Amino acid sequence: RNFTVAIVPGDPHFSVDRDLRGELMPTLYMNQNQWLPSFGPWFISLTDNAMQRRVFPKELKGTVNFQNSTSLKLISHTLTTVASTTADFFADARHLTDTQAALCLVNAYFCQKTSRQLPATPDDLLADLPQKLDLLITQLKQESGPGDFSFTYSNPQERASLAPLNKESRYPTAFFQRHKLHAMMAKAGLFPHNPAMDLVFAITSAMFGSDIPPFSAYQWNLRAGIVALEVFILAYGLLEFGQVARGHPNRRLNLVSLLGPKFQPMLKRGQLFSFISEHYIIPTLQANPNAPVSFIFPGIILAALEARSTPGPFVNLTGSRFNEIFEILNQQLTFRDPLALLQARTALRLATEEGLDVLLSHPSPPTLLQEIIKSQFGGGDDYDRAYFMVLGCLPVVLAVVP
Amino acid sequence: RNFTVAIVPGDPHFSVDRDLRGELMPTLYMNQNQWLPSFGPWFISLTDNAMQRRVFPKELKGTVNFQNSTSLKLISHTLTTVASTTADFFADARHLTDTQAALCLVNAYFCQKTSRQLPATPDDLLADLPQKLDLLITQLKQESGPGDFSFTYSNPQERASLAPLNKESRYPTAFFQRHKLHAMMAKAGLFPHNAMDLVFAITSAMFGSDIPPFSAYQWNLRAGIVALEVFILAYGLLEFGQVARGHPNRRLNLVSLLGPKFAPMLKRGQLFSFISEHYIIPTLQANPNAPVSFIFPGIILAALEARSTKQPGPFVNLTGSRFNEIFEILNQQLTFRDPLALLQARTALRLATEEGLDVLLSHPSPPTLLQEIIKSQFGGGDDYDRAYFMVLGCLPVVLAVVP
Amino acid sequence: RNFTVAIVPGDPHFSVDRDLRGELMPTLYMNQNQWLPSFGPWFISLTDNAMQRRVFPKELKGTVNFQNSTSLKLISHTLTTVASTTADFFADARHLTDTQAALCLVNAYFCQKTSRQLPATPDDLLADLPQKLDLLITQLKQESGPGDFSFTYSNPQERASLAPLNKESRYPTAFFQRHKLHAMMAKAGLFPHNAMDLVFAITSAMFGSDIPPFSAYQWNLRAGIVALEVFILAYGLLEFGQVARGHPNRRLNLVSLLGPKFQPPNAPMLKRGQLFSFISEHYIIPTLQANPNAPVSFIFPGIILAALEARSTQPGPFVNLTGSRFNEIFEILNQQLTFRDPLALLQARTALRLATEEGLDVLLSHPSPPTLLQEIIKSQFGGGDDYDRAYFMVLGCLPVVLAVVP
Amino acid sequence: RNFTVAIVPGDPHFSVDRDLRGELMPTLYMNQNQWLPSFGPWFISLTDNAMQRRVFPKELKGTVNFQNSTSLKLISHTLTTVASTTADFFADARHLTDTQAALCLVNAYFCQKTSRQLPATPDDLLADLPQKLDLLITQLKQESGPGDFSFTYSNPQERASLAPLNKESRYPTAFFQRHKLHAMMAKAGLFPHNPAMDLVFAITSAMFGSDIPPFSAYQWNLRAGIVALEVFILAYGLLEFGQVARGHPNRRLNLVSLLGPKFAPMLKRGQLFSFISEHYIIPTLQANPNAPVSFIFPGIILAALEARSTKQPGPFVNLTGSRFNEIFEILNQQLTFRDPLALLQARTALRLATEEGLDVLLSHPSPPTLLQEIIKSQFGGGDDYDRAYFMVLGCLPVVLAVVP
Amino acid sequence: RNFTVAIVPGDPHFSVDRDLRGELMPTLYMNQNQWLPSFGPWFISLTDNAMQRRVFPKELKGTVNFQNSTSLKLISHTLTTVASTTADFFADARHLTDTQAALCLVNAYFCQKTSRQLPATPDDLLADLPQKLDLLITQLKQESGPGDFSFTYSNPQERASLAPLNKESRYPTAFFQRHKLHAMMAKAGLFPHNAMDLVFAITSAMFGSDIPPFSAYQWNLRAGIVALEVFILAYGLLEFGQVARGHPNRRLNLVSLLGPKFQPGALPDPNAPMLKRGQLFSFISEHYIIPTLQANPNAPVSFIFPGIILAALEARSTKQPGPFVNLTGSRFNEIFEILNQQLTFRDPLALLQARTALRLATEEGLDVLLSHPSPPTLLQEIIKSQFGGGDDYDRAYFMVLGCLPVVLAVVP
């Protein structure tokens, strides 16, 4: 079950057993006499905060944290936590993965707007994904009027739950009323209340079985799908005019430094995302068909968590931006409380949805995204941005002896 | 509950959860292969003495103390002890914090001398604090006659107690008679014995009916006078301060300490105005009951050092007397856990600070003596270093582990 | 029972108690303040993978693995596992070692083609081994037609067993039908079904009456063919070898590795087959005189490693973060150091042997086998010349000294 | 209770709580990543021997001993043991400290030889100490005839006891008969047997109470006083023509190296000792009035222990442990065995070995020359500055880089 | 009870409490941040082998063994084992030390061949030892005929015992028949079977009446012959020795090893008159052998010259010409078995058998050394190849120390 992925054109292909991040990071702690990895300003601040926490797992407090680095246990557990943000923890047969729901939405929209035949197999959902996303995004840019990319809650108890309260299948009437992406797809005829044709239901009943109900009747799949679609929209927008051939002076990632002996015309608009879709998204989903969108692009999740936080020069010594990640780590490594871990997972997911709304509500979303990746994660070019979305960090080698 | 502070103009703002010193210092021990922090001559002498002590907490004797540095546990426990100098340990409803009592005194004095409206909210107490302090100080400089900034004790048992003996509400008649700051405020009509009491009008409007008049329950008057002395010394030290210039003797280098985490001259009083608006006010908005020792621990340390200030010429100080009060608190709370002995140790540190504040304020040029102590014992060479030393209680530097 | 071996001409002789690899490697961890050994790209990838394994023996995870090196326990246990690839674990009196079976085959073929007298003693089997191998190889090169160097399985359960299924003495009819080396020896009259059987005349004169004819009990024929493939690859690799030249890409430096233990041009070049003749007379013969039952994997573990790597062989730059190439070695290590399950260890040993046979077929099926072999030794093991290739075949690695302080 | 001392002119004053050696040495182990202290050839040999001893306290065998240095526990316990050499361990009201007895002897001798009034207070005993010692020494140099600076024992059991045997107040008649210093003071009329005026008794009854008996009646004070006087005589003689202003090429002690951030007309004869007496001896005795002479000058005690050793001519490597036996036995008895009687015997052996070595030093034709040789060869001292500091510290520490 | 020794002329004298090797070696582990000792190729091979042994005492496997050195516990226990090779472990009143028996033999031979009066005191035994050895050796060189320096065993059980089997006082008739040294002394009239017995006259005057005649109780004769072989090899090795000149291949550097402990002062003249034949051994006899025996009168010959014992153990091993790497552990088996028996198993009988095996291996190697056509030449080759000794200075110090330590910087 070995699979191969490639992130940017001209770069090497990576053959992995299961997970690229999980198999790449440990290899950076094998030359501890000469160098140790560093994962950027945000991870340096995370490491500083983690070592000060009164309640924090002892196994994540290894000596490497005090040597201008982050221990392997701390960096891998942090990245795993981020990758599980949009994973489904409700044991429900009516549920699709957020990635599958997002793919059904963008494919139904494409069939409604073009004369293209409805997708037959899950492979057809991923075929021409850059073109399907490009059509949805160019129409979303033309969506004038008030509203943002947020869900409307009218109660604090309602906000603390991912699913509708009192075991209901639908969210209250106001829930999606202010969401621009939902409004555009609703106007196009998707997810209707019922005999109005439901393209999403025709796709779900042909590939994902009879158990998946119409998105308007059981609205969890609509909410999860919208949020995963926001991640794909941000990923497309960030790489839209990307170029990687040029050796940028501010390029942080150096695979020759990190890998050592293990390593052996301009791009048109949308070509960098097409490469990542064909060589990374498709092989990742072929190996892990139920992968959440947070597993595909953990860098977008991290940038969204950072967008919530956003006068002059400033030093951030606060730990609030690490609270959701640290609570999951404390619940699964120290307290082992299954209920408290489920609540911690909900808090991380809600914080990400809040940050995604900040990113998409900005007048130029890729500009804010570029600023966060540069300031908090050290990414200076399109090559760094593409690798950061996939890895969740941009590791560098720093000599142990100066 | 995150809050932001700024110490000097042009410098970065620091966002902290609760405490700047407590959150900044641990970050200096995260590159132990390349460098370790050093906190100045006084802390180098403290570290030398602490490792020689027969009775000293074992957790404060970590290996970093023997590597041209001071361990994180030793430096943070020392700074916490200094920051708690004027903290209230009597559980009394009639008590204000020393900072609140000092603010009531300086605000009542300002209303008496200017006829400006009495402060309504605790925010009004801090509004125009540099101007309120400047009026009190310029009048204190004109206070001619004998007397100093000390309390008069007529018994050794009386000296060993912070509150009046035999559970009394007032101190003996001689207690405040030699204090110039008390005498000036008494002559102005503040805290009268019953006559309009401006302090009581302020305390009953913001701090409740439980706070008695300062003349009836004199603990608040004594604590307020001492905290006011710390604010006076802080204002005087920064009075003609400039930070724009990159001084050759500037010890503090935040670019070195923080790494990846990081024109018109200032008029008289402008450096203190910046520290009041960007540090004092946000600190008190987050911790309304903060003692004056938590706001400016550097003044407390300079006061403890002023007591020490005999033969002229070169001299090596291998004595531990200047660390006795801090070390006794550390021994009582980390090793012996004796509640009574810890309370006596806390009183001894507070009395030693009051003794040193009197030395500082009795000097003909108080900021000059203050500058000398900050330079010799703490390594501070300019106004930038002095402002940061008052806030941090030290001036950390990075020293390479390998030479 | 001390014995002496020499690998290449002009180099020192090594006196060992039992095993050269096992006695040489520990001596590289005796200057840990100044330097630590490094065993090449394949072992660097192995070390990376071993430290990531959820189930892996704790004693093999020492600190040296994280200091640009491989711990002594990990490198020695890996090399021992490779050296035991073709060791016989069936306690059977009808069984020869794969080396003995290969020697009987090449000697019977030589007598059939030259009419030289049949070998009388086990020493006669090894006498003129370069010449006996050279005759078999030059005839194998002339073997035109379809087929490769693989065994034909018609069932997955049949593939998972080394011996024939249902305790049978013969493999199914299709088993050897596609093997070129078997076909050439069968056409020459060797191992007939009963016709004079030269192999049986050799086995009954030196290895006792218990060894049955190769056509009747076919395990010895299968084991012998595979060991013969290893000897063929070893001969082909060193065929035009020269060691006198101090090559710029020579990785192995014994002066660096041994230090004070080692007491250190116009010389004529080695003729064709002379480098292999030196290794046969000074390494193969003394090794077999000391350990008569040594498997071919103990003689040349480097060929076994190159064969395991040949199975692995998208176009362009590539980073290999997979652990599949180490699965068989790691499973044996887990089964003998941690779980101590006799059945699971036997299955793991079978899997390593089958993977090696698969890789040997890739190496021999290549149009120029020594060229592919040279490429694998260079890319995965760092060997840049004939000196490195000869030492790699014997040691299973090419250790270098790397300074602990840069 | 903080006090200040100064060792040589032009050097800094040291403010200490109780003990200069005890407070200075720990400060040398605070930069262990860059440097460690080294205390000279004798201490290097001591460290080598201590680590080889089968019976030696484990707490004194720290890692610093194996890193071209001596651990803080080993160096401080060694120096404390040397400083306690002449400390009084008999709980007796009739006893003076050896320093007090030596001061009474030199002051009584000065009053007998000059018109000067008898000292009234203990401060008067120390007033003009260089001048009082100078008078006694110049008369001792004129003492012709046989005899040395040793006590005469006529029995091995008598040699193993500091006090007279069978609880007697006087030592046998032969005991002081060969001692030149005792003979000179006896001829001068000091300590008479009784109506002969006793100047020593007039001093002791005025400052040290009525419990101190006349030196001739209770002779322990006379024996202890004579030995402490020998230490003061050797200290005066060593620094008699000392100069410190000159920066000598062979000066080992470098206080700028050791302390770091914590830190012309010639001296006339006796001026270097006058400085050490006024700025070190007097403030030390004002803070610790009952200090033994071994606490004031432990370097003289160490040089005396080394003088016993001083067989074959030429280059020589000393791998013996005999010179450390007395110090090591005290360390074993107080840190490991805790045997009160054996510790008392070990203390007596160290004191008797010191008395034996002081006799070797004073019997040499040029005592400061032998003293200079020992301080140079065993302790690394190359000039008067080093010699003055060695007498006070008992060693001359140097900083040696951990990385070469 | 401190005593002083000197090994070569012009060098410093060493004052020790009891043992030079035991007191010198620990001083080399006191500067571990800058340097660590290295004891030569044989000890490097020993250290490599010791760390690979499945059965080996854990206390001898310290970290220093893995830092281009040998731990203090391993080097001192190895040297102590070698020094105890010929120590007497039979609690018998009829027994002399092998050194005392060798001295009685060489003194009786000297009295038989010269007009010299029989020695009266144990000091007279050591007086003129170079001259007494020189007379015995020059006569041994003239001993023509077959035979070597070995004992003849006619049974494997007989070979496994140091003393005669079945509690007998005499060895079988064939035992000494092939030994050239025994044959020469027997022809001279020494140890007769009862004829005047010069050896018995010496033993009964200095070592008491308990020592029986060498022909009646033959253990003293066997032990004495073997110790005499060690003295003969020591004399032969230093016979034409010179030390004044600073050789380029001189391994031992006492200035490096001792540092501040060594006061160099005045260095010897390299252009000074040469040492005459026997003068280097005379210096070692007067300044090392005599003071060592005055301090430890019952010292075995292996304690005086452990380097000869090590060279003898190495002589057994001595087939192919050229460069050679020795990865075998056979040469360390006898030493390692003693170490395992006294530090790990604590079996009194097995330790006694291990001690016998080391003594028999040494006797076998001494025969190889003395049977070589030029014994000092083979001895020089072994000291150079296995112990790093390149000159007479190194050879004299190697005989005494059992090794030639060098300082190697921890940081290169």
Numbering used by the authors:
A (entry chain J): 126 to 319, 329 to 398, 408 to 453, 459 to 550
B (entry chain H): 126 to 319, 330 to 397, 407 to 453, 457 to 550
C (entry chain E): 126 to 319, 330 to 399, 405 to 453, 458 to 550
D (entry chain D): 126 to 319, 329 to 397, 407 to 453, 457 to 550
E (entry chain A): 126 to 319, 330 to 453, 457 to 550
The authors write:
Herpesviruses cause severe diseases particularly in immunocompromised patients. Both genome packaging and release from the capsid require a unique portal channel occupying one of the 12 capsid vertices. Recent symmetry-relaxed cryo-EM reconstruction strategies of α- and γ-herpesviral virions provided first snapshots of the unique portal vertex that is essential for DNA encapsidation and release. Here, we report the crystal structures of the CTDs of pUL25 orthologs from 3 members of the β- and γ-herpesviruses (HCMV, KSHV, and murid gammaherpesvirus 68 (MuHV-68)), highlighting their structural conservation across the herpesvirus subfamilies. The overall structures of the HSV-1, HCMV, KSHV, and MuHV-68 orthologs are well conserved as reflected by high z scores resulting from structural comparisons using the Dali server and in spite of a low amino acid identity within the “twilight zone” (approximately 20% between the crystallized fragments of HSV-1 pUL25 and MuHV-68 pORF19; illustrated in the structural alignment in S3 Fig).
The pentamer has an outer diameter of approximately 142 Å, a central cavity of approximately 14 Å that is slightly narrower than the diameter of a double-stranded DNA helix (approximately 20 Å) and lateral interactions that bury an area of approximately 1,049 Å2 (±44.5 Å2) on one protomer and approximately 1,147 Å2 (±53.1 Å2) on the adjacent protomer. An extensive interaction network consisting of hydrophobic interactions, hydrogen bonds, and a salt bridge stabilizes this interface, and its calculated total binding energy amounts to approximately 19.2 kcal/mol (±0.9 kcal/mol). These inter-protomer main chain β-interactions are likely to confer extra stability to the pentamer. One of these acetate ions (acetate623) connects 2 adjacent protomers via polar interactions with the side chain of Gln458 of the adjacent protomer, thereby further stabilizing the pentameric interactions.
